[PDB]
Each structure stands twice: as structure tokens, then as C-alpha cells.
Design an enzyme around this catalytic site. Structure first.
Site, mmCIF file in Angstrom:
data_model
loop_
_atom_site.group_PDB
_atom_site.id
_atom_site.type_symbol
_atom_site.label_atom_id
_atom_site.label_comp_id
_atom_site.label_asym_id
_atom_site.label_seq_id
_atom_site.Cartn_x
_atom_site.Cartn_y
_atom_site.Cartn_z
ATOM 1 C CB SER B 99 -0.647 0.325 0.925
ATOM 2 O OG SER B 99 -2.012 -0.897 1.501
ATOM 3 C CB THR B 152 -4.509 3.722 2.394
ATOM 4 O OG1 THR B 152 -4.359 2.457 1.372
ATOM 5 C CG2 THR B 152 -5.323 4.538 0.319
ATOM 6 C CG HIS B 328 -3.775 -9.801 3.615
ATOM 7 N ND1 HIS B 328 -2.700 -9.844 3.004
ATOM 8 C CD2 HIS B 328 -3.759 -8.086 2.993
ATOM 9 C CE1 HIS B 328 -1.997 -9.052 2.544
ATOM 10 N NE2 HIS B 328 -2.553 -7.399 2.341
ATOM 11 C CG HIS B 367 -1.394 -3.626 -3.673
ATOM 12 N ND1 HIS B 367 -2.535 -4.606 -3.061
ATOM 13 C CD2 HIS B 367 -1.733 -3.107 -2.793
ATOM 14 C CE1 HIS B 367 -2.811 -5.288 -1.963
ATOM 15 N NE2 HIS B 367 -2.263 -3.480 -1.631
ATOM 16 C CG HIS B 409 -0.229 -7.392 -1.518
ATOM 17 N ND1 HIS B 409 -0.032 -5.902 -1.115
ATOM 18 C CD2 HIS B 409 -1.090 -7.184 -0.208
ATOM 19 C CE1 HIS B 409 -0.118 -5.869 0.024
ATOM 20 N NE2 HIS B 409 -1.240 -6.355 0.077
#
Ligand SMILES: [Zn+2]
Ligand SMILES: [Zn+2]
Ligand SMILES: [Zn+2]
Ligand SMILES: [Zn+2]
Lengths: 446, 446
Positions: B99, B152, B328, B367, B409
Site C-alpha cells: 500500500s 493509504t 489477507h 494493487h 498481494h
């Protein structure tokens, strides 16, 4: 109408603005990209299993992260489309489709169950875009790197309850109702010979060795029938390039391999913990692949040349089949190589389309696949492999959605890009069946 | 400028044309969607880890395969963008970003290494779009469902060598050069208090309990500093709705949770062979959720209201954080629920944007993530779970890219959609850094 000339990182990826792909405002460019005028021709490029992950992995390796596929990435109008299938019994959605159901979707405009070709869930036949193009007098081309009996190219000319019904033998067992000797329209191969597309190129010579169990050509091999019906048979690049014309009177049928055509790049299969235990891989060109075997781009170029002679216009479907097959086999190099292979075919198509001015070019996939790009130090439960990219950096690919034999398809919506008249119809969210209607409308098929 | 009113399957998914999402030609609609006029405001919606797979899985479950997200899927201009990061040492691409690096990319326009916030690979600071908007006199809003110290929202107001440097304590250890008592600009939280955005809403109350090691407010808690600096503190929906104005003189700071805000839906974690051994799951609403805790849509609505009072215009970033976090944790219901949650926020933004006429709305992700939609009978090596969808059918989700603690990711390029002035700049293939330049240009920031 402009094609994206260059969307590669504009400079030093390390410095501010260096990774940019845009050099200025795109508003004007897009306006010039919009036209509702009729399309005289349509070239549909299908990357089997080429979802966004596949495109990115291939770009990273072959062109570098800041790279740009001159074909695949050049299409100005982009969007995302759904490709879910149907459950035969319930009629409810089956989130993960196969090639059969998806191909049927864009070729007929009706959803169907996995395994079906040109028929709906009630097993009712449905006319395909190719058959419709032909009926209207347009030239037609069906090109693929897979066996011509495979789902994608088959869906354009065959209507069978199961994709497995390649020729007479399999049909009698798997598709009794379609079996010729039982009054049906015949196997995929037989229906292919019936549909009579002007140009049909690909593999699948093997099945043509079978013999018809009934009909006017009973006892003869499907190969003999093809010749007896007027088809021009070609088995290599040399002979292919020798073809000067292709039409209903002299249709072209090129069988360049028994099964699927040769893969462009070789590489070892992904393995458990392959990225940490084994060294980074560098793909190597397949020596098997020959000057005698035409590439997808060559087949595409020849096809366009012959089809363009038809003043009325043409419909051509080109398929990079092995992207999917290699993805199933968890082989990064084979998968990537086939994507690069497809890119060349897209370039040829786009070149012609740019000159012609009345050609709609669409590049998309039938469904998403398994491969994922993951961190270098990833300890995953499936198959992984580290690859040496054009950037001089390592990229790790993972296949972890199956234990079993092959890797499974995935239901993620994926990219659909287009260029030319009516291309706007692929922007935003659409369904795979919408593609049928878009192509039909663009061509003015009524 | 029109928004896609309805792109849901138009009829009977079983019948020909029933799965169509289009009812006619989209050319005219797209033309009316193109404008190069200046944008007075910009609302950027970020679905953390919301790649195409995540969107599709959420749609399938909540709206059905032929469904349509009135927010997420409503944006007319779509494209795909790359988000690779850089290796700090080599400067070469790192295909899978976090991120921090990705947020820095769109907020500053420069690529960086994983873990970095507002700094490049040389650890040099670069002004963010928020700081630039503020400098130009525009109102600014930073909204997220995660801790305000998370990457973020942090990337918009902080410049640290490591995302881990939440407050004084962590900074002294992890970011010595940024540590206040060592002459640096301070921790993420201190720099946030700094930056003084007009509106900041989210979680992360916990870190505010720490005390400054130096500066004018040494010894006081960051909470106290905020109050001493004129910030309006709000801890619940009731008080939030009570806010009549927010500006540089009276900035709003809403801390609605110690850590990350509550997830919308509860469901069991995916398990090994979960789809075949365990029953299909039906997500259930989280009782913890609260009339006292504002939803992302509520925070978004209040933010727009306050920010819209600024005649000059505003910049607002809204983030559906838990999509990533739940991905996750291999929890389909939490992941999907957060996607539905984000969709509501997008609807509020689009509603306002449609009325205002000079607002650029962008919906994208930082992502791609791990989750994949796979066949019901799939035997995968990772975590899987069957879910009962709105269609009354079963959908299986797979997480198979990691064995340890959280799923990784993925580097796949993903969907970016927009609506409003300058939206054309998101169509086709672009880079995450391009978004910075697009927003900067649209706002006429110089
Ligand atoms: Zn396929
Ligand atoms: Zn496949
Ligand atoms: Zn993220
Ligand atoms: Zn994450």
C-alpha cells in the site's frame, strides 16, 4: 482513428514522472476514436485464458514492467466483461466457464452450460456469427493454434452437446443425438466441413483421419471428403503462402499439425517452492517450431489477405490457444511465449485495420486463468517459478488453485479492448454475450 | 454527462440476448462522457486490494452474476493500470507492491520502494496531491476505514522512510531520521496533525494516545496536541453529524475506533478443502458494526457536505481499507462485505458528482490481491470456501498464494474507472503515477 502509438513508461522509472505512460491529455484522442459508422470487417483476437494477470506477466517478462505490447496494449477503447456460464439442470449461474460455453456466448449470443458448443441449455442450436456472416455473403475465416476441433474454433461452425465429440468415433459415444448414423448433423469435424468457411487454419489433422459412418461420403476419411468437396488442403507454411485465392468455390483448409501446433518458448514446469529452491528461469525458443510451421501472425496475415478480396467484407476469428493450455500445465515460459505470439497477430490485424478504416478489431479472452504474479520471497502451497525478466529483475509466478492435474480457470471479469467502428460498445462493464450483438450490429447483419 | 444507469443482465439469462448488459449502442453515450473542461473537485475512491477478481466475487455474491453494482460498475470510462514498485537498492522494478509504494505513486507521481511513504528511493520527500491542493486553497479530505496511520491515508500527509513509523515510539526505532527529537519532521501521526487537512475521518485513535518526545507540544499526548491546535475531535456518528463546518480554522478529525473500524459482514475463515468438506456459507451482518459507528458512505457524505462549502473546490480521498485486510485473512465474507460497503460510498460520490457537473470521480485499487473464483468441485492446495450467492447458486473462492500467516498481494494490472471532466485519461493502459498527473492537471494545480 488513432491507435495508441506508445504507452511505455516515458523515461526514468526512478525519477518523478518517469513511469508515466501518458504524455498529455487523452480527451481529443478518444473523441477521434468514436464512430458509429458501419464496420465492413471484424477481426476478433482471442487469447485463450488470457486474463489481466496473464497480460501483465507476459509484459513484465518480455517488455519489462514499464514496457508496452505494440499490439495487445495498443487498443484505445477498453473495458471489463463477465463470462459466467449456466448450470444445465438449474439454469442458475456457473461462475467458472470453460472454452465451450464462453465461445458459444460470443458466437451465438446465448449463455450455455460448460462443454456445450453452439447449443443452449435445452440443447437447441443457435446460429453463430460466422454462419450469419456467411449467409449475408461476407467472407469468413477461422484461425487457431489449437486443434481445429477444440472449443474456440469449433463453436463457430459446430453445434454439439459436448465439446468432446471431435469426430465420428467420439460423437457416437458422447453425442448420440448429433451422430450422423443416428440422424444428427455430425461431429465437430463433419459440421466444420459442412459450414464451409472460406479460410480455416490451425491444427487437428489427426481427427481428419477418421472415416464417416454414414452420409454421401460414408467409408471415406474426413480428409478425402474435404478434398472431394473442393477444399484446398495445406500442411505447411510454404504451401500456405502459395494460396492466391480462397472462396466458397475453393475454400482453404490448413492443417499444420496433428494436434495443437508447437509452442513458441520452452521452459521447465513450475514446482513446489520453485522460486526459493531452484534458480531463476530464462525462457528459450522452441527448436521444434519450424520455418515449415507458420506462426499465428503469418496465418493471420495470409487470412486477411485472402479474405480482403471479398468486396462485401469479412469476419475473422483468430485464437492464441496455447496461452490457456500452458497455464493449465503451470509452465510460465510456454504461457508467456504464446501471449507474445498473440501480440504479433494483433499487430498485423491492427496494421490492416488502421489502413482499411472500416475494420473493428477486438482483443479479449474467453475466461481468466490460474497464474498470479507474487513477491519473490513467497512461500506458496502450489507451483511457483522465478523468471529473469527483460528488466534484469526477478518475477515469481504462482499456480495454486489445483492439486490435481492441471490448474483451474478462474471467474474474474477481464479485459476487452477494441479499435474501429462500434468499438465504444466494449467500454465499461459488459457481458460476453454482448459481444455477439456488438459484432452483429457493427456488420449490419439482419 | 451520464452515468451507466443499469448494466445488469437485461432479461432471462437462459434465453438468447437475456444476459446482455447493453440495450443499444454505446457511441453517443461515450461522446457525451468526454470533456476536457477543468474539474473543480476530485473524489478518489480506493478499494484496497480490490482487483478485478475481488469486484467479480463481490458482485456474484451480493448482486448475482448478472447483477450490477450501482456504484462501482456505474463508471462509464474504464481502463487498466500498472502499479509495480521499485527495488530500493537496484532501482529495478519490484512487480508486487504494497500500500505504501502504490499510494505514494498516485499521491506524488513518483515510484518508490515497498514500505515508503511520500519519499522516493533516495528517501527524498515529494509533495503530495493533498498538500498541493491545500497550497492552492482547495478544501481537502482524507477518509478511510483503516487506522489513519495506515499507508493509504498516511501517504497523503506523511513523508517517512517506513510505513511502520506510526507515532513517536515506532519512529524513534524505525525512522530515526524522521524522529522529531532527532530533528526530523515527525511520525506519521505528527505529520498528519501537521498537514492539517480540513477533514480527516477514520480509525487509529490508539496511536493518538502517545506523547511527543520534543517540539512545542512535548510531553502532551498527540490527542491533546490536536485539541490545542484547533482540531474538532469526533468519536461517533452522532457527533460527526453534528459538525456544521470544517476548515483550516476548525479542521475535523474523527477517530471512530482504536484500530481499524468494524467489518460489515462476519463469516468463517477459508480452510483447506473448505468447499468440499464444509457446508456453503451465507454471510451474516456484524452486530458490532453500530448505529454509533458511521459507515464509509456516511463518512463520505458528511465529508462532501463540509468540503463542498469551499467555493474554490476540494480534493477528497476515500478508502475502503478492509477489503485488503480481509483478503489477507482469507475471509470471503469480510472481504466481500467491505466491497459492498465501498460501493455505497461510490454511489454517494457519483450522486453528488452527477449534480455538481464539475467533479471527477475515480474508483480503483492500489494493487491486486490473492482471492480467485474457482469451480465448485475444485481440490486446491490452499484455503477455499463455498458461498451461497444471491443467485441461489454456489461460488467457491480460493486463496492459494501463501502458507504462512496472510495471503499475498499479486501484481496483475487492474481496473480503473472514472466519471467527469478529464476522465478520459484513465482509459486504455496507464500507470498508477499517471493518476497523479491526471488529478493535478484536472484541478489545474500549478
Ligand atoms: Zn479457454
Ligand atoms: Zn483451459
Ligand atoms: Zn494495499
Ligand atoms: Zn495488503
Amino acid at each position: 482513428m488513432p491507435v495508441l502509438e506508445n504507452r511505455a513508461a516515458q523515461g526514468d522509472i526512478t525519477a518523478p514522472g518517469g513511469a508515466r505512460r501518458l504524455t498529455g491529455d487523452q480527451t481529443a484522442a478518444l473523441r477521434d476514436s468514436l464512430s458509429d459508422k458501419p464496420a465492413k470487417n471484424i477481426i476478433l483476437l482471442i487469447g485463450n485464458g488470457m486474463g489481466d494477470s496473464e497480460i501483465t506477466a507476459a509484459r513484465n517478462y518480455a517488455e519489462g514492467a514499464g514496457g508496452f505490447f505494440k499490439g495487445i496494449d495498443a487498443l484505445p477503447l477498453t473495458g471489463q466483461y463477465t463470462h459466467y456460464a449456466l448450470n444445465k439442470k438449474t439454469g442458475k449461474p456457473d461462475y467458472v466457464t470453460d472454452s465451450a460455453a464462453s465461445a458459444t456466448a460470443w458466437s451465438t449470443g446465448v449463455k450455455t452450460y460448460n462443454g456445450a458448443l453452439g447449443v443452449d441449455i435445452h440443447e437447441k442450436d443457435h446460429p453463430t456469427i460466422l454462419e450469419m456472416a456467411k449467409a449475408a455473403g461476407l467472407a469468413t475465416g477461422n484461425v487457431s493454434t489449437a486443434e481445429l476441433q477444440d472449443a474456440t474454433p469449433a463453436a463457430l461452425v459446430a453445434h454439439v452437446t459436448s465439446r468432446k465429440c471431435y469426430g465420428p468415433s467420439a460423437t457416437s459415444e458422447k453425442c448420440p443425438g448429433n451422430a450422423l448414423e443416428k440422424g444428427g448433423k455430425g461431429s465437430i469435424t463433419e459440421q466444420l466441413l459442412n459450414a464451409r468457411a472460406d479460410v480455416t487454419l490451425g491444427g487437428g489433422a489427426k481427427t481428419f483421419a477418421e472415416t464417416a459412418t454414414a452420409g454421401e461420403w460414408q467409408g471415406k476419411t474426413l480428409r478425402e471428403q474435404a478434398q472431394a468437396r473442393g477444399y484446398q488442403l495445406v500442411s505447411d507454411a510454404a504451401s500456405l503462402n502459395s494460396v492466391t485465392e480462397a472462396n466458397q468455390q475453393k475454400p482453404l483448409l490448413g492443417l499444420f499439425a496433428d494436434g495443437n501446433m508447437p509452442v513458441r518458448w520452452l521452459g521447465p514446469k513450475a514446482t513446489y517452492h520453485g522460486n526459493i529452491d531452484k534458480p531463476a528461469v530464462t525462457c528459450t525458443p522452441n527448436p521444434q517450431r519450424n520455418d515449415s510451421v507458420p506462426t499465428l501472425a503469418q496465418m493471420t496475415d495470409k487470412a486477411i489477405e485472402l479474405l480482403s478480396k471479398n468486396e462485401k467484407g469479412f469476419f475473422l476469428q483468430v485464437e492464441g490457444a496455447s496461452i490457456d493450455k500452458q497455464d493449465h500445465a503451470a509452465n510460465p515460459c510456454g504461457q508467456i511465449g504464446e501471449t507474445v505470439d498473440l501480440d504479433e497477430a494483433v499487430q498485423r490485424a491492427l496494421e490492416f485495420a488502421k489502413k482499411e478504416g472500416n475494420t473493428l478489431v477486438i482483443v479479449t479472452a474467453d475466461h481468466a486463468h490460474a497464474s498470479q504474479i507474487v513477491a519473490p520471497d513467497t512461500k506458496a502451497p502450489g507451483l511457483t517459478q522465478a523468471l529473469n525478466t527483460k528488466d534484469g529483475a526477478v518475477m515469481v509466478m504462482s499456480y495454486g488453485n489445483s492439486e490435481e492435474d492441471s490448474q483451474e480457470h478462474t471467474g474474474s471479469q477481464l479485459r476487452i479492448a477494441a479499435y474501429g467502428p462500434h468499438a465504444a460498445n466494449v467500454v465499461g462493464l459488459t457481458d460476453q454475450t454482448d459481444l455477439f450483438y456488438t459484432m452483429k450490429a457493427a456488420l449490419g447483419l439482419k
